[PDB]
Symmetry: none
Subunit: 132 residues, 4 copies
């Protein structure tokens, strides 16, 4: 029969999205699971950035969160936050622009890179049907 839309189902169907290229592309072999998870969590945060009007002249969405707020968002400690930021920045997934005074740094989450090998690999896995 025609079933209702439940609030339980609605919240079970909320997720953090990690790009598949993080598990196929060998250009992201250095990323740890914590980095992958963090990237996804920050990706989900982009929504709040827009509501906070954190958009520059070019239309790029960024973050103006303090280290303590980031630690709360990523549910991690200072040393882990530092390691995560460096890992993502190292792979061009995050850009940092330190501000003067004691102001929180400006963070720009970036989109991943995709090569032909990644496409090939991703397709092969998504079409890995059982042999008839």
């Amino acid at each position: 029969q025609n079933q209702y839309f439940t609030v339980q189902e609605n919240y079970k169907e909320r997720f953090y999205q990690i790009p598949k290229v993080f598990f196929t592309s060998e250009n992201y072999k250095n990323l740890t699971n914590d980095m992958k998870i963090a990237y996804a969590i920050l990706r989900d945060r982009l929504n709040l950035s827009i509501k906070n009007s954190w958009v520059d002249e070019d239309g790029n969405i960024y973050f103006v969160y303090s280290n303590e707020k980031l630690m709360e968002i990523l549910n991690c400690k200072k040393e882990k936050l530092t390691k995560i930021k460096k890992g993502l920045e190292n792979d061009g997934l995050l850009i940092q622009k330190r501000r003067g005074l004691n102001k929180p740094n400006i963070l720009y989450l970036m989109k991943p890179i995709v090569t032909e090998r990644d496409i090939y690999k991703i397709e092969k896995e998504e079409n890995d049907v059982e042999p008839y």
Copy 2:
């Protein structure tokens, strides 16, 4: 100017989905990063299960993968695979049905549970805008 749809952007927008409840629920604190990610990879495999016609009489989608194959799917060693299955199973996120002999076990991925506290937390975070 109107933009084209590119194949790179298309594969760039392909991800694995981890339920948000796995990061707020006090019922999923035992899940490790590898377990959450594995769960998301298996959730995505449900697509191939449909193409493989792995649907029981009740319409429930399941898996008929050998442990070796699961290892390749989750890209982990037998040691880790055993740990992941147990972790997901203890939290009711995975059900196993042994067919004995050499017939691969039947795995059923399950949907997470959501409580009032999970809804409260998720919603709290979803609307955590910077105060005026």
Copy 3:
């Protein structure tokens, strides 16, 4: 002028204690800072074990905390908990008795070992006054 006893000073003078031997003895060179700190936090918890009547038949103090509880006490994730317990256990600083099922494992915190070299090293460090 005599001073009062203030609550600020009182709470300011509360600490977690880490055995100095963890920084002199080479028998503990494998311990990470998280392990040394965790050890100190569990040490402080012994006070609560007594109140919970968690005392062995021989008078030994133990813990009956679930993995969820320990994670909260040590403010860390599942992965960290496992690594901490393993590290303390490998150095004889922690004894773990499993009860299987969903019953919390019995944990016995242990006192460190001190050798002549440890004595020598510790004595020299706290007597390291500046030469005349």
Copy 4:
């Protein structure tokens, strides 16, 4: 039966003390484990400071160790020292005063601050008995 006081138990019961507020206070979240531990080690060195007569006219205890000596004390690298000193100073846990030249700088270890929230958290944890 009555037991003796052993030297092994005496040295076994020697520790570095880290303020609990460093794990509850939302004002010390930026302190890394190395910073907390370094602070505790320096708190212990205050003893040696007194023996070295490193006390100003106001009775305040200070340090006059060279950077390379601090590296040995804390058992860390020069780069790590710079980070530890910076982190402690940002949270008002350490004060530095220069004297120019190669003359070692004057370091003043400071006591942490406690808020109503810290008190509430600490007291809550210290009375967290099994229901």
